[PDB]
Amino acid sequence: RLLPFVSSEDPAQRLKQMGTLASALTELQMEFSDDLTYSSGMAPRSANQARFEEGGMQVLTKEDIETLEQCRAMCKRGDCPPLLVVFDSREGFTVEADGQIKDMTFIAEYTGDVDYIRNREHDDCDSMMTLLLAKDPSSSLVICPDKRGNIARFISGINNHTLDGKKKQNCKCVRYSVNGECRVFLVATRDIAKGERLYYDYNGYEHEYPTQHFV
Amino acid sequence: AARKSAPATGGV
Numbered sequence: 001r002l003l004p005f006v007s008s009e010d011p012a013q014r015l016k017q018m019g020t021l022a023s024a025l026t027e028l029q030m031e032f033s034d035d036l037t038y039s040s041g042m043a044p045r046s047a048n049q050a051r052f053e054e055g056g057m058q059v060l061t062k063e064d065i066e067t068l069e070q071c072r073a074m075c076k077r078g079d080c081p082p083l084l085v086v087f088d089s090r091e092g093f094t095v096e097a098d099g100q101i102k103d104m105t106f107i108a109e110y111t112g113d114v115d116y117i118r119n120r121e122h123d124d125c126d127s128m129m130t131l132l133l134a135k136d137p138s139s140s141l142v143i144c145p146d147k148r149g150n151i152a153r154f155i156s157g158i159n160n161h162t163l164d165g166k167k168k169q170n171c172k173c174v175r176y177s178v179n180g181e182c183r184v185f186l187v188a189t190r191d192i193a194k195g196e197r198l199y200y201d202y203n204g205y206e207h208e209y210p211t212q213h214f215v
Numbered sequence: 216a217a218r219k220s221a222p223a224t225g226g227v
């Protein structure tokens with residue numbers, strides 16, 4: 001079952017954490033957005049229907065929905081998860097734990113503008129994320145945090161080409177149906193210590209992300 | 216395009 005995150009107790013530390021995110025967003029010319037956003041110029045909210053997912057989509061349970069809403073409310077009142085955005089010479093911006101994060105803890109929703117994959121065929125963004133994979137490829141959707149987004153777009157991925165790379169993975173990106181809509185969330189897959197860098201698998205489903213050069 | 220992706224079944 002999903003567990004809510006435990007925000008750092010010192011308010012100064014939460015301030016620092018949010019500051020590191022604000023500066024990274026600024027560097028990438030982005031605004032902060034902790035929800036999926038829709039528009040008629042791209043993909044209307046009505047296109048996001050989990051029943052369109054080829055082969056079906058797992059449904060988030062009432063209990064885990066309650067936990068998701070607790071976490072969302074915490075973020076809005078200023079209790080963010082204990083995470084620091086830090087520049088790394090090899091990886092660029094990366095995300096690391098700034099407090100303990102237990103196995104099964106909700107980390108973040110992957111947010112940004114939602115759009116049709118067919119509309120992003122020629123897009124250079126390095127942070128596109130699958131939202132809905134439909135039988136008809138012209139109905140499939142992607143999340144694009146190129147203009148708006150949150151901390152999730154800064155999390156690193158593993159090298160899918162090395163025997164040792166999977167050993168680094170300490171969280172997982174999953175897609176769940178919530179009130180009938182697709183949603184993408186990140187969850188810890190083991191206990192994570194302070195200072196530890198977060199990594200998930202960019203190629204969970206489709207293998208559309210090149211990682212042979214990753215550290 | 217380069218696209219990250221996640222499963223829609225199988226839990227965590």
Ligand SMILES: Nc1ncnc2c1ncn2[C@@H]1O[C@H](CSCC[C@H](N)C(=O)O)[C@@H](O)[C@H]1O
Binds near residue numbers: 093094153156214
């Ligand atoms: N394990 C890894 N090793 C090296 N680079 C990585 C990496 N994981 C992610 N990255 C970098 O991060 C990109 C994904 S978007 C993640 C945020 C990015 N590091 C940034 O500075 O904005 C990848 O294209 C790659 O350039």
